[PDB]
Structures are given as structure tokens and as C-alpha cells.
Design a protein around this nucleic acid. Structure first.
Lengths: 47, 81, 105
RNA sequence: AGAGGCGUGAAACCGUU
RNA sequence: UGGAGCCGCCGCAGGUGCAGAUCUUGGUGGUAGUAGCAAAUAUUCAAACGAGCUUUGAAGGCCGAGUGGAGAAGGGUU
RNA sequence: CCUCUGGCAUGUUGGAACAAUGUAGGUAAGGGAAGUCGGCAAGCCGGAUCCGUAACUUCGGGAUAAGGAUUGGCUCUAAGGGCUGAGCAGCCGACUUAGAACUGGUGCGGACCAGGGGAAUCCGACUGUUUAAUUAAAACA
RNA sequence: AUGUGCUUGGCUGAGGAGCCAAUGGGGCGAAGCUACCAUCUGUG
């Protein structure tokens, strides 16, 4: 039992839980080395 | 190697818990990721029989108690009523 | 010759005395007995023998067992040991007057 | 690279000679 | 060894000198390869893959108002 | 408590040994609370059937008071129903109760389950509630 | 000695044989350990 808004929030939170693309490490001024990753057990969503 | 998927599918198809995978056909199994029915038909995977729980002892004592046995003062735990 | 096969009686009763571990101890002591008798550290227990040892649960192991030790050539594997000892179960009606005998094969 | 995904590189502490 | 700035004298100025504050932050010891990894009976044999408690088969066991089968709340892809 | 369907691998590991001290269980001759602030804990009783049951009492109780006997296995007897043409013949049918004989190295609620009892004093009538995480009480109601 | 009898409930179709019930319960009990619960010893 979910609402549409909760489900959309969950979908957005799911689409953000991926590693960075590797080619971004090759850019000219890149300071990132890895991804704000979230684990369902380690950290809980704001609900 | 690992046959968890094959055993789970066999349990679901056979409607049992009781699944017997042939220990010698471990390579003809493990490439049946969907085919489990085909392996059932040729006997590579079988349904084992139910472990026996006989009622012969129960029937024999029930007959003995019909004749009237094990029903004395020393065998009663409840009141008459 | 090192491909001998011989037949022994193991007093399981005295090898497990004063010891939930009696059947595991029986298996360990049978393996130790086979290693002592045949010298080969590679000892393989037949599943029928393991079933015989566990015939009355972990707690009440039979007092004596009639076993067969066969020293095999190990031509299959390239393991450092070039001989192994297969241990087989020999059911017997009685243990009285049973000696260690070589079996011809 | 006695600069090796990191300038120099102290002390506490440790290894070795 | 280090690789890009720095110091003397005459004055001016100051957030200007630490061993303590059960000081703040960061790092590191002895303790010490020590306490410990002891609630719920229990594991064994063989084979397979593999560089090297997993899987399969066979035994022996356990749960027996369940250690079974399904949901609600919660979680949010597990 | 044991099993079948279903499930699991002993609950963050394994191996060897079996010292002390410990935690959790079991037993102990003779004595039997002499221990201790105090019988703390733990051990006696315990199920059924048949007998028996006091003081006191608000006559409801107390009360399973207290106290005694029995209980296994096996082979019988008797009684207890439904359909067929003050009582006779068949077919079907589920479990009890009581009374006996025989029989065991007196053992038999054989494990499990399962009230120790009595004579009094104080307080609160009773049932109920209460300081989550030191006080369940005579406190509160 | 889980040694050998007996026995409850369950289980292996029955028996012979056994197993489970965190030692099922109970009788007797080798060894070992152990008691002023020793018919052992304790001094110039």
C-alpha cells in the first residue's frame, strides 16, 4: 500500500543509488573519485 | 556446482517440498535454468516418497482398549466427568 | 606388494571411553586405526561404513566393527601421496574368535 | 616516483641494522 | 634533502612565546595477541566445482500456540 | 513428550584436553534446621478412583481441610444403542463403567504432567491498581 | 563403564534388535575418586 507521491519519491531515490560513470574520471578538472550512496539497511530514508 | 535454482524449480513443479536430484547427472542438471519438466520426465529429478508414519501401533492398542485394556485406575488422568 | 587388502576388527568400545561426540570420535578413531595399520595418511571411509557407525545415533555406537582395509594404488590423482586406504564395512553375525586375515583378490 | 593517482614531510610510536 | 622564495639594521604595529587548565582538535602507545568470539541437544561419510563452513547424494538429529504456509504497520528494491 | 507435511543446520568459528574457581543440572551413609537475621533454596506432596474430613463461619464456605486405601499386564463376566416380523428371533454400531480370575524379584498417575500440611498473631474485607528501570505493600481504589 | 536388568510415551509394518524424550525414569553395579563415614602412622 503506497501513494503515488511516496512511490515517486522512492523511484527518485532509487535512480540516485548508482556509481559514477567511469569516464567522468577522465575530465580536465575532475575532483570526484566515487559517489552519496545509500544502503537500505545502513541509512534510512526521510520518512 | 550450485543447484539451488534447479531444486527450487523442481519443488515448485512437482508440488512437493522431497526433491531428489540425480547425484551423477550434475551437469545435465545446472543448465535447466527454466526444462525441469523435461528432467522430471526422463527421471533425472524425482519426487521422494513420504517418510513413513504408520498407525499400526495405534490401531493395535485401540483394539486392545476396545476389549478393555489400559483403562484401569492407573491409566486415567481426567475426572469421570 | 603394496596393494594388499586385509580384514580387521576394531574395538570401537575402548577407543571411545568416557567421551554428542561418540560417533564423530568413532569416525576419527577408525581413520586413525587405518592410518596406523596401512601407513597411508590418505584414508577414505566408505559411506556404508559411516552408515554402520551411525546406526544407533551419535550416542550409542556399536562396540565392535568388522572392517576391510584395502591399500589402493591411487593412479587417478596426482596427489603427493601415491597410495590410499579404502575402508569398507563388513557385516558379521558374531565377533567371537575373529582374527585378522588377509583376503586374496 | 628517495613526486606512483601522490609538494615538503617533524614528533609521539614501531621494525631493522 | 628540499624545491621558491627569504633575511639583516633604523622605526612602526600586534590575535606575538605553553607542560599543565578532568584544556580543544588530531594522531599514537603500554595494557595486548590479552579479555574474549560459552543462552536455544548435533553433527558424519562420499563426490562435484574450485588456486584454495558451498552444492548434490546418503546418514544421524532438531522445530513439532512451529524454526511451517500467508498478510497488516514499517522498510523501499532488500 | 514423541512423530508426519513443511522447514532447518544448532544461531559471530573450529580443534585438543578434561586442573582449579565458576554457571547450570544429579546423587549422597548416619543425623534431620544443630545452619541462618530468617528453612534462603530445594526437597516432601502432587493425577485419577474409593472412603473420610475439624475448629470456626457472613451458613455461601473452610474443603483437594486433615487422614487412609488403590492404580501394571493379561483373560473374562455383566450392564449401557439403532433398524427388521411388562416380549421372542437377524443385521448394523461407538465407546465406557463396574465386578472377577490369572500373573510379574511389590512393581504399576513407572517418562511427561502434577496442591507439602497444621495450630496462631498483626494488617488489609474480598476481586482490582500501583513507583516502566532497586519498594506489589499494610499503600491506592 | 551410559555395564546389565526392569519400565512409561513415541517411532522404525510386527519381531528378534533398537532409537528418541538437552542423562526419560528406576534397580544393582567394575574401575577410579573419595569420608574420623580409616580395625594406617606421628619421634630424639
Amino acid at each position: 500500500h503506497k501513494t503515488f507521491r511516496i512511490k515517486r519519491f522512492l523511484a527518485k531515490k532509487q535512480k540516485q543509488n548508482r556509481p559514477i560513470p567511469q569516464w567522468i574520471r577522465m575530465k580536465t578538472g575532475n575532483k570526484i573519485r566515487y559517489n552519496k550512496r545509500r544502503h537500505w539497511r545502513r541509512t534510512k530514508l526521510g520518512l | 556446482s550450485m543447484l539451488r535454482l534447479q531444486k527450487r524449480l523442481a519443488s515448485s513443479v512437482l508440488r512437493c517440498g522431497k526433491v531428489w536430484l540425480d547425484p551423477n547427472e550434475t551437469n545435465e542438471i545446472a543448465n535447466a535454468n527454466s526444462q525441469i519438466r523435461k528432467l522430471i520426465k526422463d527421471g533425472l529429478i524425482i519426487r521422494k516418497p513420504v517418510t513413513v508414519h504408520s498407525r499400526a501401533r495405534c490401531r493395535k492398542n485401540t483394539l486392545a482398549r476396545r476389549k478393555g485394556r489400559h483403562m484401569g485406575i492407573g491409566k486415567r488422568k481426567g475426572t469421570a466427568n | 606388494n603394496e596393494v594388499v587388502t586385509r580384514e580387521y576388527t576394531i574395538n570401537i568400545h575402548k577407543r571411545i571411553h568416557g567421551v554428542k561426540k561418540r560417533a564423530p570420535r568413532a569416525l576419527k578413531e577408525i581413520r586413525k586405526f587405518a592410518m596406523k595399520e596401512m601407513g597411508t595418511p590418505d584414508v577414505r571411509i566408505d559411506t556404508r561404513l559411516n552408515k554402520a557407525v551411525w546406526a544407533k545415533g551419535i550416542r550409542n555406537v556399536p562396540y565392535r566393527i568388522r572392517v576391510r582395509l584395502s591399500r589402493k594404488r591411487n593412479e587417478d590423482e596426482d596427489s603427493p601421496n601415491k597410495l590410499y586406504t579404502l575402508v569398507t564395512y563388513v557385516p558379521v553375525t558374531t565377533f567371537k574368535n575373529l582374527q585378522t586375515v588377509n583376503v586374496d583378490e
